[PDB]
Amino acid sequence: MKRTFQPSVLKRNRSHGFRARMATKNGRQVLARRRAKGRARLTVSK
């Protein structure tokens, strides 16, 4: 059965990666929040 997650690296990056996040204000905010939290992996970026 075709399950929901069907990985594709480029797609992932474009969607969720650092640059995408940077591009918008909300993305930036998210990043900031993550930083505040103390996340080790700030984004999906490898």
Tokens 């984004």 -> residue: 43
Contact between 7 and RNA by CB under 7 A: the answer reads yes
Contact between 8 and RNA by CB under 7 A: the answer reads yes
CA dist 3 and 19 (Å) reads 28
Contact between 25 and RNA by CB under 7 A: the answer reads yes
Contact between 1 and RNA by CB under 7 A: the answer reads yes
- Residue 16 makes CB contacts below 8 A (sequence gap 6+) with 43, 44
Q: Which of 23, 32, 35, 39 binds RNA (CB under 7 A)?
A: 23
Residues that bind RNA (CB under 7 A): 1-11, 14-15, 23, 25
